[PDB]
Design a protein around this ligand. Structure first.
Ligand code: K0V
Lengths: 412, 412
C-alpha cells in the first residue's frame, strides 16, 4: 500500500549558478541569467540571447576523456545528479543498489551533438560520424551513465514530454517509490537546445522573445509587453526517498512530495486552451492526490513561460481551481530570471518550490512592470516576498497538451 | 491491492506488413522483411540494408496537411495507435475521456526531420527551418496528436529508453491502470532511423551487420556467424484496459498483462555483462510481480538482437533464472525476421507474444544454422513450433543497461 516520499538531496546547473545555493541566491535577489549567447554566431537568427550555464567545469564530475563523448545535456544531467546524490548523504551498497533507480529526462536531448554530426555527414561523409553519436546523444543516457558511475540497479528510464519533462520525471519517480518498485530515485531533467536547430526551430515557430537589445527584460511573465519565451540551458535533480527509509538512516528531509497530477488538454499540438481547462484538471488531480483543501496552497511556481496565450491560461486555471483563495496564495514565475529550461524547467522549479518551503519566501516574477488584462493575482512582482508556506505547487505544461503538477509540503 | 490489466486492441507497422495479421503471417512463415534500403544513396555506408515499412499510406490516417507536419516516426506511431483503438472497439465519451491516456515512445525520435532541416540550415541558413520542426519532431507528439485527435484527457506521456522503450511504455501504462490512475491506455513505441544518421551513427559504432550481399541472412540471433543487429522501422500499439472495464462493454480480450519488471545493469553504455546479471534480475522482478514461479513460463520473445555479446548474455540470464526449466520453455528472436525496430522493438514483440498465446505457437528464430557455444536452449530454429503456451515473456535490454520484461498469460 502507498508509501510516503520525501526529498533528501537536490542538484542543479542553471543560468544563475553551477549549484543549488548559488542559483537560489540569484532567485531571491531577482537576478537575470539571460545574456547574448557567446558559444555560436547568431547574426542570421531573430533571437540572439538565452540562459547559458556560465563557466561549467565538467572535470569537477567526469574525466575529459568521458566528457568528450557526451552531449552537454548529458554532462549537465550527470552534474545535477551527482550534486543531488552527494547532498542526500546516501551510500550505495550491495544491500540497496537494486532499490535505487534514476529517471532523468529531456525534451530534445543531444541536438548540438546531432547537428554537429549531421554537418560531418553532409560536408564529408558517414565515415566522419562519431562512433559515440548514439550513446552520446539519446535522451535515456543520463539515467544510463548515472547508473554506470554510481552502481544504481533499480528502475532506469527517461521521460520526454517536452516542457513538462522535469515535472513528470519527478512525479512518476515518486510513484515508483510510493508503490514499492524502488526506495530511492534520482529524478529530474536536463536540456541544452541552444544550437542552430534549437534557436532556428523555435525561431521558425515565432515562439521566442526577439528582445535582442535588452535580454534581461525579455522574460516578462504576465507583463502586457511579453513576446515569447527565452530559451535556457541546465539541469535539476532530486533524490526522492521512501519516508521510513529516510528516517531509518537519519537523512535530512527538505520536504514531502504529497501530490502528483497529469492531464492532457487534447486541445492543440502547441497552443494551450485560453481557459486553462487542462491545467485546472491537472492541479485538481494533484490536490485530490495530496488529500488537500485547495485553500491549503500558499505558493505556486507557475509554468509562466512569457507567452501571450500560456501566461493568461495559467491565471484562468488558478482562478478556476482556487476561486476566492486565488487572491490569498502567491504565484510566481522564476522563468522571469532563469528563462525556459524546457525539459529541465520542472526539475529546477521543483527545487525552487522546495527551497520556498525551507526558507518561507515566494521568489519574485521580475520584469512584471504592467500586469496584463486579468493578471490581478499576487504574482510577487519585482521582489521576493517572505510569507508562510506550508504547501507549494509547481506547474508545467508542454506541446502535445501535456500537463504536470507537483505538490510539496513542509515535513516535521 | 491492484487491478488486473488485459489487452483488447493491437496495431502495428513492421517490415513484414502494414498491420498485425499481415506481420504475424510473415512471422509464422519465417519470412524476412530485410532488404537494401531504396531511394537513398548509401554508397559511402558500410551497411546498405535494413527493415523498411513498405507501401505505408499515411492518408488512410491523416490529411496530407497534418502528415506534412510530422516526422515518419510520429506517422508510424499514429498508424499503430489508430489501428489499436479501432481493434479494441472502445468508444470515447465525456464520461470516460479523463480515464483514457497514452504512452507511445521512441528510442531516437525525429532523425529524418532533423536531417532534412539540417540540409536547409547549413545550405540556406535558419530562416528555411520549418515552423513545425520542433512539434513535428519531438517524441511525445504521438501521445500529443493521438490525445488531441480522440479527445483523450488521461495520463499523457512518452518514454525514451533506447531499445527498451516499447517494453517500458507498455509496462508503465499497465501500472497506470493497475493503480487506478487510468482505466485505458494506448501504449507502445515507434521508430524510423533508416536515415543517414541512424545507419551512419550505428555504423560508426560498428554495431550493425555489414552482410550487404545477403540482407535476409544478416539477422541471425545466437548463430556463430552473426556480426551485429539490423536496423528496422515501424510501430506497435496495444490498448491496455482494466479487466472489469473490458468485461462490462463486452471487449474481445487477447491476453492478460500479469507481470512487469525493470532493472539496470549499471555495467556499460552499449554492451551487457557477459552473464546477463541485469536481464536475470529484470526477468525475476517480472515473475515476482506476476506471482509466478519461473517453471510456469512457456515462451520467451528474446531481445535477441544478433550482437555477439547481447545474444550470449540472454542465454546466461535465462539459464540463471529458469535452472532445470531453461530447456523446456521455448525462446525465439523475431528480430531474425523483422530486424531491430529499436524503441518499437518491445511493442511489436509484445504483440507477437500475445499472438503466440492466442495461436499456441512459438515463432521461429530464422537463420539459426549453427548455434554458437552454449546456445543449446530450444531457440525454435528455422520454423514455427506449435506448443502449449500459458505464460509468455517479452524481454528488451537496451543502451545504458536499461532492461524491461513483460509477462502475458492466457485469459479465460
Ligand atoms: C472528428 O472527430 C472524431 O472524434 C473522429 C476522428 C476519426 N475517428 C478515428 O480516428 N478513430 C480511430 C482512432 C479508432 C481510428 C473517429 C473519431
Amino acid at each position: 500500500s502507498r508509501r510516503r516520499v520525501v526529498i533528501t538531496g537536490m542538484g542543479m546547473l542553471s543560468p544563475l549558478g553551477l549549484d543549488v545555493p548559488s542559483s537560489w541566491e540569484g532567485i531571491l535577489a531577482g537576478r537575470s541569467g539571460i545574456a547574448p549567447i557567446e558559444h555560436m554566431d547568431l547574426s542570421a537568427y531573430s533571437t540572439r540571447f538565452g540562459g547559458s550555464v556560465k563557466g561549467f567545469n565538467v572535470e569537477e564530475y567526469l574525466s575529459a576523456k568521458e566528457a568528450r563523448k557526451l552531449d552537454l545535456f548529458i554532462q549537465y544531467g550527470l552534474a545535477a545528479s551527482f550534486q543531488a546524490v552527494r547532498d542526500s548523504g546516501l551510500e550505495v551498497t550491495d544491500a540497496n543498489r537494486e532499490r535505487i533507480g534514476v529517471s532523468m529526462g529531456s525534451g530534445i536531448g543531444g541536438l548540438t551533438n546531432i547537428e554537429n554530426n549531421c554537418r560531418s555527414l553532409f560536408e564529408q561523409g558517414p565515415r566522419r560520424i562519431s562512433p559515440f553519436f548514439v550513446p552520446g546523444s539519446i535522451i535515456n543516457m543520463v539515467s544510463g551513465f548515472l547508473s554506470i558511475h554510481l552502481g544504481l540497479q533499480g528502475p532506469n528510464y527517461a521521460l520526454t514530454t517536452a516542457q513538462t519533462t522535469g515535472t513528470h520525471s519527478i512525479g512518476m519517480a515518486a510513484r515508483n517509490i510510493a508503490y514499492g518498485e524502488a526506495d530511492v530515485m534520482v529524478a529530474g531533467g536536463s536540456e541544452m537546445a541552444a544550437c542552430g536547430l534549437g534557436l532556428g526551430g523555435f525561431g521558425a515557430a515565432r515562439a521566442l522573445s526577439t528582445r535582442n537589445d535588452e535580454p534581461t527584460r525579455a522574460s516578462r511573465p504576465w507583463d502586457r509587453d511579453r513576446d515569447g519565451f527565452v530559451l535556457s540551458d541546465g539541469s535539476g535533480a532530486l533524490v526522492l526517498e521512501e519516508l521510513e527509509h529516510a528516517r531509518a538512516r537519519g537523512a535530512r528531509i527538505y520536504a514531502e512530495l504529497v501530490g502528483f497530477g497529469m492531464s492532457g488538454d487534447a486541445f492543440h499540438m502547441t497552443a494551450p486552451p485560453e481557459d486553462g481547462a487542462g491545467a485546472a484538471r491537472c492541479m485538481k488531480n494533484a490536490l485530490r492526490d495530496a488529500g488537500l483543501d485547495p485553500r491549503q496552497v500558499d505558493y505556486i511556481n507557475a509554468h509562466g513561460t512569457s507567452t501571450p496565450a500560456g501566461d493568461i491560461a495559467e491565471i484562468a486555471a488558478v482562478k478556476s481551481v482556487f476561486g476566492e483563495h486565488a487572491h490569498a496564495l502567491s504565484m510566481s514565475s522564476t522563468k522571469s530570471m532563469t528563462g525556459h529550461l524546457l525539459g529541465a524547467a520542472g526539475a529546477v522549479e521543483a527545487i525552487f518550490s522546495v527551497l520556498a518551503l525551507r526558507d518561507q519566501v515566494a521568489p519574485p516574477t521580475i520584469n512584471l512592470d504592467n500586469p496584463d488584462e486579468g493578471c490581478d493575482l499576487d504574482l510577487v512582482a519585482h521582489e521576493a516576498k517572505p510569507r508562510k508556506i506550508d504547501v507549494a505547487l509547481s506547474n508545467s505544461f508542454g506541446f502535445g497538451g501535456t500537463n504536470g503538477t507537483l505538490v510539496f509540503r513542509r515535513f516535521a
